[PDB]
Amino acid sequence: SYQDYINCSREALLEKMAELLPEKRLTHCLGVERAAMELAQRFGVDVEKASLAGLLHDYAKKLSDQEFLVLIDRYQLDPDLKNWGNNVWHGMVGIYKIQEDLDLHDSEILRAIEIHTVGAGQMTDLDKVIYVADYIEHNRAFPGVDVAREIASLSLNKAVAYETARTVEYLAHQGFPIYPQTLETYNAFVHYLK
Amino acid sequence: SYQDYINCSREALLEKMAELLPEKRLTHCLGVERAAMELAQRFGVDVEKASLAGLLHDYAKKLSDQEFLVLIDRYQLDPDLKNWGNNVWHGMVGIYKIQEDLDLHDSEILRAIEIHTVGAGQMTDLDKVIYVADYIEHNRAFPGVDVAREIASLSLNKAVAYETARTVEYLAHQGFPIYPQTLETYNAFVHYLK
Ligand SMILES: Nc1ncnc2c1ncn2[C@@H]1O[C@H](COP(=O)(O)O)[C@@H](O)[C@H]1O
Ligand SMILES: Nc1ncnc2c1ncn2[C@@H]1O[C@H](COP(=O)(O)O)[C@@H](O)[C@H]1O
Ligand SMILES: [Fe+3]
Ligand SMILES: [Fe+3]
Ligand SMILES: [Fe+3]
Ligand SMILES: [Fe+3]
C-alpha cells in the first residue's frame, strides 16, 4: 500500500492533493498514476513505486516562487536554481516539500519525481516510466500524443528520446531558456530515435 | 590588406581555396566575406578583420575525420571533441589548419572562425558578425532567411538569438546531437528575442 512509503492513505493523499491543486492538475496526476502503472508492468518496474511517483509527480506544481527559493536555501541546493522557474523547480525542488508533507524517504521515487521534467543523462527505468507516463497519460491530447503512445508501447528508451526531442524543439520554437540538464537527457537518448 | 594577417594575397588565397573546396562552398565563403563586411560597417567592427574571417570561416570544411583527429591530439584539445564530427570540428579544430597553412595568428579572427558554428555564451562583436554573416549571406535561400536578414539589419544580438534558436529547433526536429556549447549560446542570447 501507499502507507508503505508515505504517512497517509491513498484516499487521504487524494483529499490533501485536491486542496493543493486545481481539478485539471489533479486529474492529470491520476492520469499519470494509471499510465505509470501500465508502463511499469510492460517494462519490469515495481508497479506500486511507479503509481505513487506518478500521482505525486506534480504535487508541488503550485508552490510559490517564494517557497521554492526558501527551499533552495534550507536544503542548500545548487545556487544556479535561483536563475530558473517553476518548470525546473516543481520536480527538482518540489521533492523537498513532498518529503516534508508526506514523510517520503524512498530514494527511487524521490529521484523519479526529481527529474520528471528535465530527465538526466542516466535514468533508472522507474525514472523513465514517470518521465514518459507524464507525457502520454490519457487526458493529454497535444498533436503527436498518438505517436508518443505507439513508441511507449514498444520502447521506453525511444519514448524518452522522442519526448525529449519534442520538448527541446518546442522550447527553441517558443524562444524559452532550456535547462542544461535537459540537453544532457537529449544527447544521451537521441541515438534511440534511429 | 590580407597580407597584414596571412602569408599570401587575397588572390593567392582564393586560388588556394578553390583547390580545397567545391564551387558551392567557395561561393558561400565569398558570400560571407561580403556579408561580414556590411555587418562590420553597421555594428562598428573592423571591416577587414570581418571580411577575412568571413572568407576563411569554412576553409577547413573538407578536412577528413582523420586529419581532425590528428589535430585534436597534436594541439591537445578537449578529448570530448573525438565524440563529435565535422559540424563541430571545421571551426573548433579547423582553426589549427588555417594557422598552419596561412600563418594566421590574430586571436580575434581565430576566435571568430573557432566558434562560427556553435557560438559561445560570451561573443565579441566580431564573433557575432561572422556567426550571423554565415547565416544571411546572399547565396542562402532557406525559408526564413528574409526574417534573419531584417533582424540583422537592426540588431546583431537579436540576429544571434534568432539564428541559434532556429538551429537548436532544427537539430531537435532532425534528431541530431546538439553540441553543449550551442546551448550555452542559446541561453545567453535567447532573452534578445523579446
Ligand atoms: N529544460 C527545460 N527548461 C525549461 N522548461 C522545460 C524544460 N524541459 C521541460 N520544460 C517545460 O516545463 C513544463 C512542465 O513540464 P512537465 O513537468 O513535463 O509537465 C513544460 O511546459 C515543459 O515544456
Ligand atoms: N551544436 C551543434 N551540434 C551539431 N551540429 C550543429 C550545432 N550547431 C550547428 N550545427 C550544424 O552544423 C552545420 C554547419 O553549420 P555552419 O558552420 O553554421 O554552416 C549545420 O548543418 C548546423 O545545423
Ligand atoms: Fe511536472
Ligand atoms: Fe505532469
Ligand atoms: Fe561552417
Ligand atoms: Fe559557412
Tab-separated table of all heavy atoms in Angstrom, chain A residues 2 19-20 22 25 48 51 58 62 67-68 73 80 100 102 104 128-129 133 138 141 160 162 172 176 181 188:
chain	number	residue	atom	x	y	z
A	2	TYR	N	0.275	2.411	-0.232
A	2	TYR	CA	0.987	3.680	-0.275
A	2	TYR	C	1.564	4.053	1.095
A	2	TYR	O	2.659	4.634	1.173
A	2	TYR	CB	0.073	4.791	-0.836
A	2	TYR	CG	-0.069	4.828	-2.358
A	2	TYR	CD1	0.440	3.799	-3.166
A	2	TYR	CD2	-0.753	5.887	-2.987
A	2	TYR	CE1	0.298	3.832	-4.541
A	2	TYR	CE2	-0.907	5.929	-4.375
A	2	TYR	CZ	-0.379	4.903	-5.145
A	2	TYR	OH	-0.520	4.925	-6.521
A	19	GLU	N	-6.864	19.862	-2.350
A	19	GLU	CA	-6.642	21.177	-1.730
A	19	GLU	C	-5.522	21.953	-2.434
A	19	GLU	O	-5.655	23.161	-2.673
A	19	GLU	CB	-6.278	21.034	-0.233
A	19	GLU	CG	-7.343	20.391	0.643
A	19	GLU	CD	-8.649	21.180	0.632
A	19	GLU	OE1	-8.755	22.150	1.419
A	19	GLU	OE2	-9.559	20.837	-0.169
A	20	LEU	N	-4.424	21.250	-2.746
A	20	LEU	CA	-3.194	21.870	-3.231
A	20	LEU	C	-3.236	22.254	-4.690
A	20	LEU	O	-2.497	23.145	-5.099
A	20	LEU	CB	-1.995	20.956	-2.987
A	20	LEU	CG	-1.574	20.631	-1.553
A	20	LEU	CD1	-0.387	19.691	-1.593
A	20	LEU	CD2	-1.234	21.886	-0.757
A	22	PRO	N	-5.627	22.642	-8.635
A	22	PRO	CA	-6.884	22.710	-9.393
A	22	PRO	C	-7.251	21.360	-10.011
A	22	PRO	O	-6.385	20.491	-10.179
A	22	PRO	CB	-6.594	23.723	-10.500
A	22	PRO	CG	-5.120	23.791	-10.610
A	22	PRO	CD	-4.586	23.492	-9.238
A	25	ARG	N	-5.069	19.713	-12.895
A	25	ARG	CA	-3.773	19.212	-12.432
A	25	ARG	C	-3.899	17.867	-11.650
A	25	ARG	O	-3.116	16.929	-11.887
A	25	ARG	CB	-3.035	20.310	-11.633
A	25	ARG	CG	-1.544	20.080	-11.433
A	25	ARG	CD	-0.800	19.660	-12.701
A	25	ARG	NE	-0.733	20.764	-13.655
A	25	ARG	CZ	-0.096	20.738	-14.823
A	25	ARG	NH1	0.543	19.645	-15.243
A	25	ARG	NH2	-0.104	21.825	-15.579
A	48	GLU	N	3.803	-0.364	-7.992
A	48	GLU	CA	3.409	0.466	-6.851
A	48	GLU	C	4.290	1.708	-6.720
A	48	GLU	O	3.795	2.806	-6.454
A	48	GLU	CB	3.451	-0.368	-5.564
A	48	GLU	CG	2.947	0.365	-4.330
A	48	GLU	CD	2.819	-0.536	-3.106
A	48	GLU	OE1	3.813	-1.219	-2.764
A	48	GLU	OE2	1.721	-0.548	-2.497
A	51	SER	N	3.217	3.899	-9.695
A	51	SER	CA	1.896	4.513	-9.452
A	51	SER	C	2.001	5.703	-8.520
A	51	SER	O	1.420	6.730	-8.812
A	51	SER	CB	0.906	3.496	-8.839
A	51	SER	OG	0.678	2.447	-9.740
A	58	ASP	N	3.518	15.951	-9.805
A	58	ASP	CA	3.198	17.387	-9.907
A	58	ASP	C	2.577	17.919	-8.600
A	58	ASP	O	1.892	18.949	-8.599
A	58	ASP	CB	2.241	17.669	-11.088
A	58	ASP	CG	2.960	17.792	-12.449
A	58	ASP	OD1	4.194	17.986	-12.535
A	58	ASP	OD2	2.266	17.629	-13.458
A	62	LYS	N	2.124	24.150	-7.613
A	62	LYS	CA	1.591	25.472	-7.240
A	62	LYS	C	2.272	26.097	-6.031
A	62	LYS	O	1.789	27.109	-5.541
A	62	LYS	CB	0.077	25.404	-6.953
A	62	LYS	CG	-0.763	24.688	-7.991
A	62	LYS	CD	-0.550	25.264	-9.378
A	62	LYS	CE	-1.453	26.460	-9.620
A	62	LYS	NZ	-1.218	27.042	-10.973
A	67	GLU	N	8.405	30.187	-1.826
A	67	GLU	CA	8.610	28.877	-1.166
A	67	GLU	C	9.750	28.045	-1.760
A	67	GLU	O	10.578	27.486	-1.004
A	67	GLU	CB	7.335	28.050	-1.168
A	67	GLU	CG	6.198	28.675	-0.398
A	67	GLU	CD	4.939	27.853	-0.522
A	67	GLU	OE1	4.150	28.107	-1.478
A	67	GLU	OE2	4.776	26.943	0.332
A	68	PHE	N	9.808	27.990	-3.095
A	68	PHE	CA	10.915	27.311	-3.803
A	68	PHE	C	12.262	27.912	-3.426
A	68	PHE	O	13.212	27.165	-3.084
A	68	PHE	CB	10.733	27.321	-5.343
A	68	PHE	CG	9.676	26.367	-5.836
A	68	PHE	CD1	8.590	26.835	-6.559
A	68	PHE	CD2	9.766	24.984	-5.567
A	68	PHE	CE1	7.610	25.966	-7.010
A	68	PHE	CE2	8.775	24.118	-6.015
A	68	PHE	CZ	7.704	24.612	-6.738
A	73	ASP	N	17.509	27.428	-0.308
A	73	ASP	CA	18.426	27.855	0.769
A	73	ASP	C	18.543	26.839	1.881
A	73	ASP	O	19.665	26.462	2.272
A	73	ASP	CB	17.986	29.205	1.366
A	73	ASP	CG	18.368	30.371	0.499
A	73	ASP	OD1	19.418	30.297	-0.193
A	73	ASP	OD2	17.604	31.359	0.499
A	80	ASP	N	22.548	28.007	-8.691
A	80	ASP	CA	22.086	28.312	-10.065
A	80	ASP	C	20.565	28.175	-10.210
A	80	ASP	O	19.970	28.874	-11.012
A	80	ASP	CB	22.830	27.478	-11.127
A	80	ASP	CG	22.332	27.764	-12.556
A	80	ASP	OD1	22.551	28.890	-13.091
A	80	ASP	OD2	21.690	26.850	-13.126
A	100	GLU	N	8.613	16.702	3.213
A	100	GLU	CA	8.143	17.404	4.401
A	100	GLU	C	6.712	17.034	4.737
A	100	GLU	O	6.441	16.667	5.875
A	100	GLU	CB	8.322	18.933	4.248
A	100	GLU	CG	9.754	19.359	4.590
A	100	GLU	CD	10.133	20.803	4.236
A	100	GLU	OE1	9.259	21.682	4.013
A	100	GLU	OE2	11.353	21.060	4.204
A	102	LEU	N	4.696	14.513	3.535
A	102	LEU	CA	4.267	13.120	3.445
A	102	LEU	C	5.272	12.131	3.993
A	102	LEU	O	5.011	10.926	3.960
A	102	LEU	CB	3.956	12.761	1.985
A	102	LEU	CG	3.051	13.698	1.184
A	102	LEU	CD1	2.964	13.154	-0.231
A	102	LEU	CD2	1.672	13.807	1.816
A	104	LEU	N	8.027	11.102	2.804
A	104	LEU	CA	8.560	10.235	1.744
A	104	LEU	C	10.083	10.244	1.762
A	104	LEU	O	10.680	11.312	1.615
A	104	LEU	CB	8.056	10.699	0.362
A	104	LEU	CG	8.607	9.982	-0.879
A	104	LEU	CD1	8.097	8.546	-0.996
A	104	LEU	CD2	8.226	10.781	-2.113
A	128	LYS	N	12.364	6.715	-16.094
A	128	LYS	CA	11.865	6.750	-17.469
A	128	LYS	C	10.373	6.555	-17.545
A	128	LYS	O	9.702	7.247	-18.316
A	128	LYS	CB	12.576	5.724	-18.333
A	128	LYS	CG	14.071	5.957	-18.421
A	128	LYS	CD	14.743	5.140	-19.513
A	128	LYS	CE	15.173	3.781	-19.017
A	128	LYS	NZ	16.532	3.437	-19.534
A	129	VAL	N	9.846	5.640	-16.729
A	129	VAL	CA	8.404	5.363	-16.693
A	129	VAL	C	7.635	6.651	-16.331
A	129	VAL	O	6.681	7.013	-17.017
A	129	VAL	CB	8.081	4.181	-15.721
A	129	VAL	CG1	6.608	4.148	-15.375
A	129	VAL	CG2	8.530	2.856	-16.331
A	133	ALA	N	5.225	8.550	-18.709
A	133	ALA	CA	3.832	8.487	-18.261
A	133	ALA	C	3.213	9.868	-18.234
A	133	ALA	O	2.041	10.035	-18.558
A	133	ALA	CB	3.689	7.837	-16.873
A	138	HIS	N	-3.735	9.641	-20.295
A	138	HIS	CA	-4.923	9.596	-21.165
A	138	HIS	C	-5.675	10.924	-21.367
A	138	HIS	O	-6.341	11.097	-22.376
A	138	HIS	CB	-5.878	8.445	-20.750
A	138	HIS	CG	-6.666	8.709	-19.495
A	138	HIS	ND1	-7.857	9.407	-19.505
A	138	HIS	CD2	-6.462	8.335	-18.204
A	138	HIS	CE1	-8.339	9.472	-18.273
A	138	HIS	NE2	-7.509	8.834	-17.464
A	141	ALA	N	-3.928	15.613	-25.002
A	141	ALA	CA	-4.378	15.474	-26.384
A	141	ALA	C	-3.564	16.366	-27.333
A	141	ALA	O	-4.024	16.661	-28.436
A	141	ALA	CB	-5.895	15.755	-26.481
A	160	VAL	N	11.485	8.050	-24.285
A	160	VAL	CA	12.228	9.106	-23.587
A	160	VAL	C	12.869	10.043	-24.629
A	160	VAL	O	12.765	11.262	-24.504
A	160	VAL	CB	13.278	8.519	-22.626
A	160	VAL	CG1	14.294	9.571	-22.160
A	160	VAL	CG2	12.588	7.894	-21.424
A	162	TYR	N	12.101	10.499	-27.870
A	162	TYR	CA	11.099	11.217	-28.617
A	162	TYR	C	10.528	12.398	-27.823
A	162	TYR	O	10.435	13.503	-28.359
A	162	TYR	CB	9.980	10.272	-29.024
A	162	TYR	CG	8.840	10.951	-29.762
A	162	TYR	CD1	8.852	11.065	-31.161
A	162	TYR	CD2	7.725	11.440	-29.072
A	162	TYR	CE1	7.796	11.669	-31.839
A	162	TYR	CE2	6.681	12.038	-29.749
A	162	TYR	CZ	6.728	12.159	-31.113
A	162	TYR	OH	5.655	12.742	-31.759
A	172	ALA	N	12.801	25.739	-28.082
A	172	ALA	CA	13.521	26.577	-29.033
A	172	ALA	C	12.539	27.279	-29.965
A	172	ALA	O	12.749	28.433	-30.319
A	172	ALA	CB	14.538	25.763	-29.819
A	176	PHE	N	12.155	29.913	-25.337
A	176	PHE	CA	12.311	29.782	-23.873
A	176	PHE	C	13.689	29.232	-23.541
A	176	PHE	O	14.216	28.411	-24.314
A	176	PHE	CB	11.283	28.813	-23.254
A	176	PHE	CG	9.850	29.282	-23.287
A	176	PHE	CD1	8.820	28.355	-23.553
A	176	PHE	CD2	9.495	30.613	-22.991
A	176	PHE	CE1	7.475	28.740	-23.565
A	176	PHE	CE2	8.148	31.004	-23.013
A	176	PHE	CZ	7.145	30.068	-23.303
A	181	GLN	N	20.441	20.485	-17.946
A	181	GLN	CA	20.213	19.054	-17.697
A	181	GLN	C	19.301	18.415	-18.741
A	181	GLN	O	19.483	17.253	-19.037
A	181	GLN	CB	19.622	18.796	-16.323
A	181	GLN	CG	19.635	17.320	-15.933
A	181	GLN	CD	19.599	17.166	-14.453
A	181	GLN	OE1	20.293	17.881	-13.732
A	181	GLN	NE2	18.778	16.259	-13.977
A	188	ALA	N	21.966	12.031	-24.459
A	188	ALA	CA	22.110	10.621	-24.020
A	188	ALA	C	21.122	9.704	-24.746
A	188	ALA	O	21.463	8.589	-25.100
A	188	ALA	CB	21.972	10.494	-22.496
